[PDB]
Design a protein around this nucleic acid. Sequence first.
RNA 1: AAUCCGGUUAAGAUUCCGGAACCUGGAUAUGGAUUCUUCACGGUAACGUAACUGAAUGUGGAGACGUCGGCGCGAGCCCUGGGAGGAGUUAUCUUUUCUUCUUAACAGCUUAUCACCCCGGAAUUGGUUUAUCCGGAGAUGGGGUCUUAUGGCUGGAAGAGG
RNA 2: UAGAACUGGUACGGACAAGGGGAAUCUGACUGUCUAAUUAAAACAUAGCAUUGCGAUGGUCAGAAAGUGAUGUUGACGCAA
RNA 3: UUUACUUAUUCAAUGAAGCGGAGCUGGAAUUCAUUUUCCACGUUCUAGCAUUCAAGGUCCCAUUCGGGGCUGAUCCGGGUU
Lengths: 77, 252, 56, 50, 135, 91, 97
Amino acid sequence: AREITDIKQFLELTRRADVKTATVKINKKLNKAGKPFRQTKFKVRGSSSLYTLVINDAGKAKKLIQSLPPTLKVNRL
Amino acid sequence: GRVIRNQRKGAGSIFTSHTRLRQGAAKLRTLDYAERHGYIRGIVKQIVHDSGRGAPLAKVVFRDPYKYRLREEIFIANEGVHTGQFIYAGKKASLNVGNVLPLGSVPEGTIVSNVEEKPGDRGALARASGNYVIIIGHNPDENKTRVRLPSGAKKVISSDARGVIGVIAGGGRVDKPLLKAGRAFHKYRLKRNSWPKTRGVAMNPVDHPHGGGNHQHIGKASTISRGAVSGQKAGLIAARRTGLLRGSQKTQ
Amino acid sequence: RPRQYATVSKTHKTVSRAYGGSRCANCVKERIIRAFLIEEQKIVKKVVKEQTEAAK
Amino acid sequence: RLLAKYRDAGKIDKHLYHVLYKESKGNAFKHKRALVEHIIQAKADAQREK
Amino acid sequence: AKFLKAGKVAVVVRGRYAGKKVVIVKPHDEGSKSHPFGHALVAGIERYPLKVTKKHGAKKVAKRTKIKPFIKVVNYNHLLPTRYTLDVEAFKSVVSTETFEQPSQREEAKKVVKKAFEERHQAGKNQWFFSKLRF
Amino acid sequence: AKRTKKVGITGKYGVRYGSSLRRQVKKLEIQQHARYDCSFCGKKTVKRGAAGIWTCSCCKKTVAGGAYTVSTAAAATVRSTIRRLREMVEA
Amino acid sequence: SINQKLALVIKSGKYTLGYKSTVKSLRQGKSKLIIIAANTPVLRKSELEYYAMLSKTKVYYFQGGNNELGTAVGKLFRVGVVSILEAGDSDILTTLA
RNA sequence: AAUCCGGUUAAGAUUCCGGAACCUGGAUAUGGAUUCUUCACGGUAACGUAACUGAAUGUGGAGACGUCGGCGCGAGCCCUGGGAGGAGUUAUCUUUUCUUCUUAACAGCUUAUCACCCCGGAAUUGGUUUAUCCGGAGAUGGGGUCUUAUGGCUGGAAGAGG
RNA sequence: UAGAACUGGUACGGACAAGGGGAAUCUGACUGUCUAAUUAAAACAUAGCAUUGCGAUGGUCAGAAAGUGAUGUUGACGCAA
RNA sequence: UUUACUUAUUCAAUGAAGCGGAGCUGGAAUUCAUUUUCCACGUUCUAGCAUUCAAGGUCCCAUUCGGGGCUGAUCCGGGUU
């Protein structure tokens, strides 16, 4: 359902001690009509809902994956 | 001989009234202490159409004196009332169009309507659209009141009985030609199953007493006695005179 | 639909005036003015009886 | 709406607009070009009466 | 002639405080920089002191007499000015245009207004301004 | 234009019903469908619905009245009678 | 009658028409007379009386409805209440108000 | 009171499987918000804000509603242009013929008639509808508020389906 | 939507689709209904006109009775015949 | 005589709510001794409001935080009218 946009809020979500699983989806799109890029989406499963976070930049997602809590069951791709 | 139609209305199976869309009984306010000593005000919030009845109803809402609530009662609208008008019921009510007063407190020649027969039955006489009775006389001896009922047949009632001031709305209603059978259909479909009446002349000797014959005619005389028995009575009941009148009106 | 209202917050079912979610703006406005002026006019109907009935 | 955009464009005033509107609610104008040539005609008459 | 002078009681007829009694503390008839219309800065009360009786205990009197005041800018068309009046020079200097924006100052203003109106509700002058207009 | 010679509204019935009944219906439906003057707001908006009931279009006041017109002549005398009879009590 | 007087007002004085502008002139105290039509609602009637006593301007009732008052002031549209604020040659400030 | 999509069997599917939701009944904690102006602030207003006590009792709304007629706007369909694939016809002709190009319930931001609010003051009467109604009981005009049916965008969700 | 040349062995709403018309008379005004398995009519019905009863401890009618009922969530511009 | 009765029987209404008598003020009333008399006896410019054994006054209780009695709302007869 929900889309949650803040990174700091997303790190609060991943430490909520009832989020058991997460997943990362790698999509491919292109800016305006010009050039392809890699989009990523982080999806954490709540007990009711499912939160996503769209990162259009690779340079922030590369550190953000590193920022995940290691106890989290991550399904990468 | 078959049991005939006019006998058959009395089991009341299909010939009942069609009361679904009717707003309510159009009774007056129950006569209580506030009415027979002082008076009491209501606002008439909405005057609303009724089905089967010609005249409109009126939502007069009074305050219940004895517990904090509102008792909302259904008057027949007098002609000239409007929504938001104050309506004063009671013995000391002023005499304006729509205040309901006892007949003991009105001058003679006052045009009232929805008037009670015996005091405390909440609105019997003069209720169809455009009617009224007129108080022509009083009698402080044994406190009676001499009124003119809308058929002209005058009456003496108790003066503690109550009537509301004015004509009843919907006047000139039967002046329009009900041009076609469909309007009569949609008129009488919200009243009862009276319609369409077949003439007894057309039908058969089981069906009626005017039946039969190799010509459409009545047979014997069509006026039947008052003392004749239920089943024969199909025609002009206990008719003292008949035929078309002559002479001028307003009889002695 | 009428039972949906059971779930939704109170700011969806209310405006913050007096007689908020049940009477509209102007009607509230009118039943101030009426309810003011009447009980001002009614005050005069006591000072009339303090002058007329005293001069009887 | 040709009347409307000529009113909002200031090429006509509100009085001649309100005349022409109820003239166009009756027939008086077969098509858009005919009404434009009628606007020119009455407006040039008002200019010559200025 | 000019009956919106700085002591009149009014009944506010629009806005969240509709049906509550204010006093005008400073009328601006011509208007202002913003608010291009005749507005008056009013001070009114939001919760009314509930009606105490002979039998309420001491502390139960105090909780009954709590007053929650408010300050407001209001247009002239949103007021019923009434014939009543109120000695307002107790807190005349507190409510101003500087009292508004910088909203932290409004709470310090509300404390002054609350003190003054409780000091008039005790020693019960102005009986009409302190009963709830009811409708 | 003016499109009928005499029938007007009752021309919707066409050829039927006779002409005296149709002239009789015309005389009342002109009264019924016309747009009347409001006793309170001073505008010309009182249109009936629901025979006997005359709502104003603005102003929301709702006068009970005649079935085919606002207040028939055998009713507007009655209030004048009341206008007379209320005066005998005092002066 | 009273109508000739209002006509002399309306061509020789200063006035304002209709409720909101009366109350604008009345709270600013430019008011000198107010004329109320008969079919005005009783609430608006009382609200204009009660604003009159704070300015102490006397109220004259126009016997006759708002359409007749709309004609009587020389306009064509209806008017419910008139506020005379500067009278010219006419003298209705001092006649019987 | 409350759900949809995708897949599945020889025969069941809004019911099974996977994903995404919601509603009621009941438990309960943690955060947030309120508080020494003890039961929130803002806006002139229409009203707004993640919240922001409230019994008896009364009132009001939704439930709640005819039929016909045009008018506007949406959805699906129909038609159709460029383009990425596949199939057909080709003695000649035809940048050709057929076909796939899809997106749910639910959630977030945003979007309109109508109605309403503020300023203002209207006759050389002005707006405005296919349809003549509206304005001093305040129109036109400037500027705002709301319903969200509906539509867009993002999530669902491209990892599904084609 | 109108118009113009030009052409067809004068053909062209080319298949489909798709009113016969007029002068009259008897009669019922009409639209509507009915003998479902022989009659759809000039019958019935209807609007319209008129008449009769009746002011509720009432009019007409039902029930074996009853502290029963229909018209009546009615009131003479109404109900009933 | 058809008069007068209410207690039988009969009718009607109300969540059987203020009946009947007496008094209390005013006031029409004229006094033929002093009151012989009858009427009144909280609400009318307004689509607002009216609910918590009732506020007030007065006496208790044992002063807590609260409760109770009378009056405010005249007595009498319990015949719902």
